[PDB]
Amino acid sequence: MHHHHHHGSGSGLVPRGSGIAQQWIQSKREAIVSQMTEACLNQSLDALLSRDLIMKEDYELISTKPTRTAKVRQLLDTSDIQGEEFARVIVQKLKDNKQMGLQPYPEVLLVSRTPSSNVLQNKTL
To answer: Is residue 93 part of a domain?
Structure first.
């Protein structure tokens, strides 16, 4: 005779306020995920890529997600592992386009990255 089983590797416990944007994501997580479509998702991803904030290993995992809605969620869960900057990129990305249904927004819009353009050409595959 034979048999099988399964298990869930889910976690998410922050010790203290890592960052405004980071915390905000958790507040409007359901909204950001329900709003941020597959399009905005890819954009936000490539954003951190240029900054070298997201690990390629994580990109693949999220890229090989079952559904788009999950891709966003996982992005927030992983952000806590990366840093405050990671989350800050999201809040800025969403606003970069247009997300009124997500409002109200946090009191942080700046990037504090560097005095220069964001990007010129999307990722190359």
So the answer is: yes
